[PDB]
């Protein structure tokens, strides 16, 4: 017999829409960018709560998963760090001498990444072709790292983002996107049945970030297998060229069909 805990908040004393991720990254950088300074708190639409240390977004390349290290190791040409956050991936390439630009819709994340030394365009992925200034791009390499394939969202959201990237892609461009290939545990079974009731696609969660009295917008998130990634590319301008696995993580190389 479950006992509902009830919701916090009341008119005039409730969480408000804002930029919690930017605020968390800023507080983390304020203290040096090390561990146990600020924390990313994620809330699912059933109230499921999970947190992690924001210091992961400032870690050097030596502390990344191998899939992320491979991607930055092989990036060539003009690079766009898609969803750069604090810019940890694009910064490693900027040190190496590459021409790197980042894009992120979080104003606080954009400012933090610029402070660390990365040029960042503050825009949604779907606004990339319209807001990309002259002289920027086209890009030979797109970084989609930090479970970037899961950041793409539901199939309709993913195809829209992939279309905007192709609009600013150079001939022969590649997307270096990492992901996770894990079996669905039985804990999500209740949540997965909730998705089927609401007509939502399987495998995805609807989550948002929480910090202080600030809340982000709901967005869809998942861990996408390489096979499901290949399916979402059917009919788009990208082919799944290769998949390199590091245990349960993988690095997918998407090649532009032009």
Ligand X SMILES: Nc1ncnc2c1ncn2[C@@H]1O[C@H](C[C@@H](N)CC[C@H](N)C(=O)O)[C@@H](O)[C@H]1O
CB of 211 to a second copy, least distance (A): 6
Q: Which residues pair with 53 in a beta bridge?
A: 39
- Binding of residue 62 to a second copy (CB under 8 A): no
Residue 145 partner contact from Cl ion, ligand X, a second copy, none using kind-dependent CB cut-offs of 5 to 8 Å = ligand X
Q: In what order do the strands lie in the sheet with 100-104?
A: 120-122, 100-104, 79-82, 139-144, 169-180, 249-256, 238-246
The residues binding ligand X (CB under 6 A) are: 21, 57, 83-86, 88-89, 104-106, 109, 124-125, 145-146, 151
Q: Which is nearer to ligand X, 88 or 237 (CB)?
A: 88
Q: Which of 30, 31, 46, 76 is the binder for a second copy (CB under 8 A)?
A: 46
User: What distance in Å separates the CA atoms of residue 9 and residue 210, rounded to the nearest whole number?
Assistant: 13
Each residue of 77-97: b (16+ CB within 10 Å) or e?
A: ebbbbbbbbbbbbbbbbbeee
With contacts defined by CB under 8 A, name the span among 15-23, 82-90, 144-152, 219-227 that binds a second copy: 15-23
- Binding of residue 53 to Cl ion (CB under 5 A): no
Q: Which is nearer to a second copy, 14 or 227 (CB)?
A: 14
Residues with Cβ within 8 Å of 42's Cβ and at least 6 positions away in sequence, in order, are 49, 50, 51, 52, 207, 208, 209, 210
- Binding of residue 31 to a second copy (CB under 8 A): no
The DSSP secondary structure of 83-110, one letter per residue, reads T-TT-HHHHHHHHHT--EEEEES-HHHH
- Binding of residue 94 to a second copy (CB under 8 A): no
Q: Which of 112, 168, 215, 232 is the binder for a second copy (CB under 8 A)?
A: 215
User: What distance in Å separates the CA atoms of residue 180 and residue 249, rounded to the nearest whole number?
Assistant: 4
Residue 255 in marked binding region: no
Residue 125 in marked binding region: yes
Q: Which of 88, 210, 237, 249 is the binder for a second copy (CB under 8 A)?
A: 210
């Amino acid at each position: 017999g479950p006992v509902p805990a009830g919701a916090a908040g009341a008119p005039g004393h409730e969480p408000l829409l804002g930029d919690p991720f930017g605020a968390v990254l800023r507080r983390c950088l304020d203290g040096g960018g090390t561990r146990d300074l600020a924390f990313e708190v994620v809330e699912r639409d059933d109230g499921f709560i999970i947190a992690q240390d924001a210091g992961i977004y400032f870690a050097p390349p030596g502390e990344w998963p191998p899939t992320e290290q491979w991607a930055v190791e092989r990036a060539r040409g003009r690079v766009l760090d898609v969803g750069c956050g604090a810019g940890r991936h694009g910064l490693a390439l900027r040190e190496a001498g590459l021409d790197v630009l980042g894009v992120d819709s979080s104003p606080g994340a954009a400012e933090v990444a610029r402070e660390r030394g990365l040029d960042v365009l503050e825009a949604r992925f779907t606004e990339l072709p319209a807001r990309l200034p002259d002289g920027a791009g086209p890009f030979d390499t797109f970084l989609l790292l930090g479970n970037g394939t899961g950041l793409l969202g539901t199939p309709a959201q993913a195809r829209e983002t992939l279309g905007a990237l192709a609009e600013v892609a150079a001939p022969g461009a590649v997307i270096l996107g990492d992901g996770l290939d894990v079996p669905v545990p039985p804990d999500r079974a209740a949540y997965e049945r909730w998705n089927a009731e609401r007509g939502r696609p399987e495998g995805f969660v609807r989550i948002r970030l929480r910090d202080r009295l600030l809340v982000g917008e709901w967005f869809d998130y998942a861990m996408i297998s390489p096979d499901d990634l290949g399916r979402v590319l059917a009919g788009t301008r990208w082919d799944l060229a290769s998949v390199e696995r590091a245990g349960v993580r993988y690095l997918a190389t998407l090649r532009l069909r032009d």
